[model samples]
Target chain A: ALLFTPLELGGLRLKNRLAMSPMCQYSATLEGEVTDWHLLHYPTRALGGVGLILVEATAVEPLGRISPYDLGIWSEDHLPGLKELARRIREAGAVPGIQLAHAGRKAGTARPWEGGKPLGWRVVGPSPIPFDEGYPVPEPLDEAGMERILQAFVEGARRALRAGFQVIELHMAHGYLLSSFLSPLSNQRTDAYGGSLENRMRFPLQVAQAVREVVPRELPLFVRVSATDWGEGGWSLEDTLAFARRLKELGVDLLDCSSGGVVLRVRIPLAPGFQVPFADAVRKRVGLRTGAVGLITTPEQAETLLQAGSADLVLLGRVLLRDPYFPLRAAKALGVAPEVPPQYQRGF
Target chain B: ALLFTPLELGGLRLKNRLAMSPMCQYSATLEGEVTDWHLLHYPTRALGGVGLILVEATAVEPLGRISPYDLGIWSEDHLPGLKELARRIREAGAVPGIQLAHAGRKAGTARPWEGGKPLGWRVVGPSPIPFDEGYPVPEPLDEAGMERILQAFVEGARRALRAGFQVIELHMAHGYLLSSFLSPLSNQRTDAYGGSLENRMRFPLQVAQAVREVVPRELPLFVRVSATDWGEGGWSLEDTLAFARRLKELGVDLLDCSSGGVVLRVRIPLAPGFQVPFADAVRKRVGLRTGAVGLITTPEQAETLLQAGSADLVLLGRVLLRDPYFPLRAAKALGVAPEVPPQYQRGF
Candidate 1:
């Protein structure tokens, strides 16, 4: 019954443990305003009794977008719509959260089926390396550029706060902006932001400090990290364990643990609970609250992860996409009462 | 069974008479390019063995969009992607078609869930009337504006042809641009293009002539009409019958007959085959081949309409959305061989 039990993450009280993972919905206005697709897609997840609904990885700035169409939170004009969405999720009885991200070296690519190539525009990173072959060699950020990008994160946090978001996640994983700095393989820069792990952690820590300063003290702040690059000499588990300690000290509530988007060349060995071990390691070593993602589909499997203390929470991805009301289904399958609406109660 | 029989509409020979009705898919890129979302949506319908797949209503110009998101055919740059969409639909064993439309007075609004208010800089119509109480009173298009609007449809047809679509549909229903001109209720203009039926039909006929000139002679050009406005003194079945003859004379191949969208206040009698009577009357009287749409969900009901000579083609909207392979399943129900792919033959 742990799967159906109410729990609190920082100040946000969840009705259950099941959460919808931050899946990309690349339908936004050119200016990155939310459309009806968003208004329609997320509430169904809430009505399905998902305790937390992470509203996709939205770009912190336009230059940091994965594609031209990705949702963004960097604009003052986007405040009203974002506020409306947050209110909608709250009204439907789920915590509304947004994953604020800057794609870094991986920015400016077309959508996945469109070849994910550098579609256009400038891409920036801590170093001037491209993600892989056929990707663009990014323009390295100088001191001013770094400050602007950091400030962008702070401003995005401020906007998310104004928009009534109960949770804010800094996306520092999957070969995006902050993760690129953490991976020595990618950040080969000979500056204060590179070299030794402490030096490399410096910029990410600065962003964390700046963002945390503006965010409300009681709200949950999550950091989604690439626990391992799944490659030799990349951002390894040890690096993630060390990074987790610093993030916890900086007051991050949950580390949404995920891996292997740092680079594309290695075998991920994807299976049921493939990435749960990384979450387990980070949680066990650093003693920080963490979330497990990837391939853990069944309710029993999710319960088993919490049962085994692999992680504190399970983030459902494709399974949730296949069935939005997974939390309701899980509750039933686990012989627990679901938080389904009274009108929907008869069907269950 | 009648559903499995090949039918000729102009020079395009459909594999069967079961067709997909034009429906809105608000999934175009910001500037109106096809995205991965579209590449997935239409091909699946074709794979389901719908004999003729008419792609959703596409704006002839950006200003003609129902929301800011509707697919557009205004630019030459959009041709390559449109060509690809048409090819994918065709390769899946169905005749590919595109519906060209202009919303006119209803042009710029928020997407349905976004309140659907008049969210536009300027809404131009044949007259300066609003669609309903809260809608914006449109700016009546000038003579020069009419020429530009007419040319926009001409350009849309040209792009559709180059895009490899085998058929083109002019949307003259749904209270869109041409429909506004056709409905006496909406068109109160005091010009050569208003008042009497002949005068009111002038602008729509002009657009039909211009677009027909550019479309390939071998392609089937359909005109979907709102046969009755469903209220007193609005566009009537008599008006549609008269309009159908003109469209037939203008080299349009089929009358995709449905009813009411010219205005919102009418009481449309709810029934499964309420609008089938419109198609039956049009085809029987006007001598133009017709399509029947509106809640005709079952395979047996669809077959009965064709057998009873009510319609030449049965266009299923929500039923097909609910079951994309309705035609394949219908063939099973009617005891006829479906056009199911070899890969699917063992299962079906």
Candidate 2:
């Protein structure tokens, strides 16, 4: 089946189409370093047979953290744990990838189960905007602020490289710093970085271009984009279609298609493979490799999506958190011989 | 549900009746130490919400290893890693336990997938008997030899305590060193240690007694016993019943009931809850707190078995290898709220 078949992203080959979506665990040390939880979590997925495992969106700066426990790549001290994480993932049979991000207006919130209350940190974004009514307004990023954040992404990618990540993904989705610029409702600045669609895409594209140039030529570089804001007059799929075309020109390897997390209270009509259409449109219309995510849980749906030429890779999120061995389980269901460790052979 | 209810063994209380069985991984370092694989494997099951996690059979002596890569408790040098492992397991919400073992005549065999061939080492048992036709004959343990091995087990339990294990399980099952002495077929000795059922239980009882004395009074000491050899004139369920009663008198807290693995070409009546009757008979007849294992796959079956006075605890093996979160899943299926990590609340 196409779901279990190999896929090449630039020079990096995924053993199968299954990719682990970058989902925040919010269990790192307050110092924003990897802990035993991460050491167990990532490699467990690798052992479960995910071909490409993308680590959670790690903050480029401490202030960029969504929560105090978010993983960080802003300091040199984070290298050892990050290297160990990458090594374990690779050794467990998956291409290790990291997502470099800035949480922007949504920064410094409590963990999801802790009620997501504001943590009273100075958050930054393209404009002086608040995520919701009770959330704190972000300090607008001036040119210097923008430059510093952009360089943080670049440096984060470099650190990720040194940590032996086979691939780098720019977390430009989820109402974070880069994604905030893509939505006109968020980026209301009267400057070259805002207003029109091209201007709105400017800062994010620059970060992508710079990160792409900094990373090695052979390694795959990906951008997770909110294909649509799912809100009226926000970042549309057409804008993402345009963004995908420009990203292809800038040496980005794949477009990990996701939606929303930009505007609040928007109806998403979530269902199985709910976001597959965005990936399908971007791959066909923009001629870019795309990863289908969001409710792409079952092997049947994931396989059919790839078989139908809708996307090149299937990225699973919550389903993976519940069933880490979904890929190996999928292989068996599809009548393919699964590759499980000899230790776990009896179970399979 | 009784399946998710707390089970008190000695002064130690399990958060739930469900447990992770002591199944070998055989992926330790050649020097018989913990590796990155173990750092991931054990904690994953802990995070999956198992009440107790019994680590794989760890050899008490170098020659007792089932394979070259068996985890060893023979040396003080193994302490740091074992301590870290125990700490992680406890931190992940499971009471960490370990199985202390000697492979007996089955020692120095290749890993299961490697065709179970002899690895050409001098194995030791109660008598100079081979397990099967092609297997190597083990050296009969003289008084000195037996004393040394008994001391190894005692030292192993002491080391386990130092390594922060909350519980210690004596590996007396599956045709291992202790089980070799329990069966008349394998222990055809003309000495006081063998020939009668009382004599057959002597060495195993001594080892159990030594381990029980070495471990703290508050901690639970378990003995895993093969309920039957599943072969005629071998260690039968009646033999296990007598042994369990003797073990109870010797201060053993519980008996982990399993069958077979003592003789080759013995056809076990394999089915769902195939070994549950063994646990039931032992618990009811011998009045011991028993752990039912072997093919207890479904939550309904597990819950009903616990409710039916079959066993006090359910230890899952192969099912857990495929589905680590079976306890949590069972909790949900049985109309109880599963206690998952806050980080993984979304998945549940």
Candidate 3:
């Protein structure tokens, strides 16, 4: 019943607890405009009856992108294509949200298929650390660079709101800029912005506050964070709990809990709903709403997580790519009244 | 045995007679260049041991795209990504070719997932006829436009050669621009471009001759023809035979024979190898090598067609999609040596 139930996040009314997790499409112009790929990709899930559709990890600045072709929201010119994409999602009756990201030191790498081969570009991080062998040492962001990055977040949030996104997720997970700052392995800064837990948390919290101010109070704001780095001497679940508490106090609506990516050699057991416990832990201990993701494939699995109060919502990734209408099939399996689109009804 | 047997058509030698047929990915920039989609799509098949990887129907003109996202070679700048694609295909040990196309009246349509709605743009064709109900009346191409299109083909072929393609396929099938001229239902022109079979074939042949003159004779030219309009008062198999004979004399190496798509109303008997007979009839009657496609999903089916002298080559569309290494699997199924790539050895 919890899986089929609608939950109001601030003033935004989600039709159900099902959400499509952001997956990098890597399909866009070098200038970062949405393409016909977005036209098909997003609407397919919307028509499949997902409650919330999070657009991919969209870069908020030029160097924030995972690749040159990654979707961007840095400039005002990006609004038109983005606005049309949001309109399509709204037309399909799915609440649209975009994951605002800055890939940082992980940025400017070749695509996954290239496997450590450089795309011949530099990156910026909290420290001048390389990701792994063959990756170039990134330039450390100075005070001005950090200020510009924070401003970029606000501008991105403003652009996203104007483009008609009902919700916005600040990406602080997956070894991106914010996550790099959060992890001890990546952030070795000696300034007031680093060192102590509160100091290390200073910059990310500043962004959350800045974005929250510009973002209308009625609109829900989500922060995705790596709950644990899953490595020795790295960001831990306890730090995530404290961070989640801070985000909740800052008027952040939800904590999209995920783990790892601060370092590559960390061993984390991978399984279906492997991260549900992390979300549940954050939800109970930090007293904030959390979303469960990672390898959730079946409707029964999603429902069981919700029914057991493992997390407030379920976010699916690869399963949705394999079947955009996963929520429809989930509805049928859970005996919930399906709100299948008329055009796709025969398929259901 | 035919599935794995080396086959030579003109100067191009395919290690095996199995090809991954051209299927529009509908994934491209609005300006029509290759994307990360191509990085995964063609390489998957090429590495999977497909003999020839025909890059999808690439538009020769801006307005000639089936959708805005269809790949284009209308400009010299488009060659970089295409050249890289050809390099990757060759590296994977497959012959790289591109299908040069103009969608004609079928241009400016919404992608298939967009339902029956038109994308609302003008298209130019041999006649001023609409495709079907609610389809806009296409502008009748004038002498200048025809000449421009003919030149477009030559430029497209020239660019394709520069892009490192070992072979070039003139897409004369699937109800695209060239197919429209070949069919009586669509080519209602009263000029020298219409009326008798020879007159209707005139413009297409001129374009072919122009392309052939520029394309090096050492590189094979493959012409994909619809073979029949599959409707009364339309281009028939008999006409296709005459066209094939003329094309062979003009240095066309093979016929990638398919059926229908001349008009929207025709229905052909869809079956495994149903179109193989068309390839057989054309090859035997016109005395030119022909390729068979349509519903050939299995190695046994493909092998049987070639062994029965129905078709010299078998182009698998859906089969390759379901399993990009369909050719590798086919080799194993047919008891031939499996040419599995080392990266995919574990998968086999």
Candidate 4:
């Protein structure tokens, strides 16, 4: 089957398995409005023949953004641009997905291009400890504050669904709000919501469950999680597998396998196929559909992962950035006919 | 004094203290030759009124490059273009500087924009441990190999001086070849190049001494050092202080104080004036002439550091990228007339 092969995800039938992984492009306006940069960037990927295109991490609230320029769906005004984005992706023959995220302790920072420093603005998280030492100590989320955050995620999901997102990916990886709750390294508070694995996972799963209730049952729902914290005494592969099973039970359709961003000292091995095993491990052990990412560049490599049953889907980030026509190239390499945008028909 | 104040730095006089810290742009030709991108990129900084424009890490040897596309100074063939680059910088009213670097264990990797994965090519270092876990273990340099590396640094220095660079900054920071020797985290060898403080520093000091011997006495040389390893039992500020004193004894004129990139896991606190204290610490404790870099933006902040005796010079990276005319802007803010380039003079 081709990358665009139709597949059943939860109760939704995906047009293709080729889903664009969420990437932070930092192109939104200061007011959290989608700019021309967002349209040009996202539509290019949609026209690339991805079965599903996930928008970059759009913040649930302004304070939830990793940078001041992060796209937000917190208010009703955000719907128009997102609806337009969804329409564009659909017209380009791809299903639209949205990653609803709150950066939590990592929020309110300068863009990576701007040195990724934390802004002096107030930040809130599950624990008072900052994302790292240089980052400002975040205001600890009390029970009431936690409830507001859960409500924000639910409201964001409602907005996404209303904006015509066929799928919703809960951003629970890479040291974001949901992942921070699941990770003991960033969540060290000793409370009903923090000490044990059951307690630590409570907040994130609750958020997921809340979103599940708000979004339609037919729409695909996914949870991105760090398979391992990549540090000692942090979230392990087994922990991820346990969490994956729990997420499945909470109505998550797919497990987006990722790792690290838990602590400061852990050394992540950078290689061509470094993180594929995590996806494979979660898929096999947890018996959940999983998406593999990180360093899968060439079409052959991605095809091999799928063919070998390592993962259900391969998420391309930098590869897609290097060549937006990756899907068309992959089709040619895989000896199949794929949709080509009319604008580039002559070249193709 | 204003940031754009002309100052004597040893034999070379700088038009301003806004030095362009050597950044790896990774836009060279396939055969490791500098391209037009380098010319276009560097000339802009000089034209923007930066006093010293240090070209990206110029590899001492072909294999010493952090990536295949890195600029090299191993042979006389690469001299003409570099000479032209220096001429352009001088014409733009900025003194040209060159950072001579050997990638050591981290060599033979793809460019940062191109995945940053190791190429499995022959990478060498003081010890066999990989830079990160998955990178290929480097072949430890035997006595003969070590001699060859030192010779490369000397030859590279001679080429830089010949290329019209009056200031030479040894790329010893960010866990490059020289910094690798200074940090125990990367240098785990039992040889003469590794054990005690003296032994661990032997290779880097020898490289500096060799460079010093070839360059003219009037010319200034600077060594960039990661002030603190930021990890437990690793390279400390105290170690850097001792090393800075030794570097001074070897006839080095300036120390470019920076931190991190020696290891992966150390948590670096990023604030407006985060790493400025490192330069302050080095200057106060070791009594060495130093420059400060890292998260420094805005003209007022840079001037504050210089005026407060935190650093003799302030190096700008991303801030310069954000606004090339930062020097002129700083000058305006400080009520001084900046030495605007002739092309942009009318606009100013």
Please give the DockQ score of every candidate, comma-separated.
0.03, 0.71, 0.04, 0.01
Sort by lDDT, top down from the best? 2, 3, 1, 4
Backbone clashes, each candidate: 0, 0, 0, 3
List, residue by residue over A164-187, the lDDT tens digit for candidate 2.
998999999979889999998788
Residue-wise C-alpha lDDT for candidate 3, range A73-168, written one tens digit per residue = 999999999999998888877999999999988888655544636564678888888877777788888888999999999999999999999889
lDDT of 1 by residue, B191-238 (tens): 898899998889999988888898878888888988888878888888
What is the DockQ (computed on Cα atoms) for candidate 2? 0.71
Checking candidate 2 for backbone clashes, the offending pairs are none
- Candidate that would win on lDDT: 2
lDDT of 2: 0.91
Instruction: Write the number of the candidate with greater DockQ, choosing between 3 and 4.
Output: 3
| TM-score for each of the candidates | 0.55, 0.96, 0.56, 0.51
Q: What stretches of model 2 exceed 4 Å from their correct place?
A: none
Best by TM-score: 2
Which candidate gets the maximum DockQ versus the true structure? 2
Interface RMSD, model 4, angstroms:
17.9
For DockQ, candidate 1 versus 2, the one ahead is 2
Least well predicted 10-residue stretch by lDDT in candidate 1 chain A: A339-348
DockQ of 1: 0.03
TM-score of chain B of each: 0.98, 0.98, 0.97, 0.97
